[PDB]
Amino acid sequence: TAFLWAQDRDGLIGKDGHLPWHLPDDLHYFRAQTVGKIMVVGRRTYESFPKRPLPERTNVVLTHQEDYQAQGAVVVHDVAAVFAYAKQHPDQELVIAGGAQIFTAFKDDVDTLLVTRLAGSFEGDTKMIPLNWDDFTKVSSRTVEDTNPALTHTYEVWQKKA
Numbered sequence: 001t002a003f004l005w006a007q008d009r010d011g012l013i014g015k016d017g018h019l020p021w022h023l024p025d026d027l028h029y030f031r032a033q034t035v036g037k038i039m040v041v042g043r044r045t046y047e048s049f050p051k052r053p054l055p056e057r058t059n060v061v062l063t064h065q066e067d068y069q070a071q072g073a074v075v076v077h078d079v080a081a082v083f084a085y086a087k088q089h090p091d092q093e094l095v096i097a098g099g100a101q102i103f104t105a106f107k108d109d110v111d112t113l114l115v116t117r118l119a120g121s122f123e124g125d126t127k128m129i130p131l132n133w134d135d136f137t138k139v140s141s142r143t144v145e146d147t148n149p150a151l152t153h154t155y156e157v158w159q160k161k162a
């Protein structure tokens with residue numbers, strides 16, 4: 001279990017399913033935090049991708065529908081199902097990308113929280129759920145600037161105390 005999402009100083013994490021801004025640098029970190037491991041995306045995030053299914057790593061789609069289809073991607077509709085699939089692979093980890101509906105499902109199972117805090121402000125309707133940052137600690141933090149000042153991003157890594 002590993003949370004992973006990108007937000008700005010306002011807390012927004014997307015807009016109409018697709019992102020409002022464009023941070024190509026963050027896309028390079030997503031490919032490294034997915035290839036080799038198991039990717040977990042919902043239905044709104046699955047269609048948000050341009051090329052589907054996503055190669056280089058396993059695809060795990062979770063929705064409340066029982067009539068979906070995808071040649072190459074895995075279609076599941078049970079929390080225990082996604083857990084049994086992750087337990088079967090000891091050399092893989094469960095990465096939660098989104099959307100917010102999927103994050104609510106894996107709320108009682110998360111120790112590492114990866115998030116990218118930006119600097120420029122943006123407008124949108126998609127926001128991040130209310131999490132508790134008092135029972136966590138930051139051990140890793142790398143600031144990365146981009147060509148513009150509004151496209152600045154900082155990779156933060158929070159972890160549970162015990």
Ligand SMILES: CN(Cc1cnc2nc(N)nc(N)c2n1)c1ccc(C(=O)N[C@@H](CCC(=O)O)C(=O)O)cc1
Binds near residue numbers: 049056
């Ligand atoms: C909309 N979306 C979801 C998305 C976008 N930004 C994020 N940013 C962070 N920090 N974390 C996430 N989970 C995240 N998820 C996307 C958009 C593009 C690709 C994508 O093309 N990924 C390629 C990147 C390859 C390339 O750069 O060409 C990969 O192989 O993973 C994936 C998810």
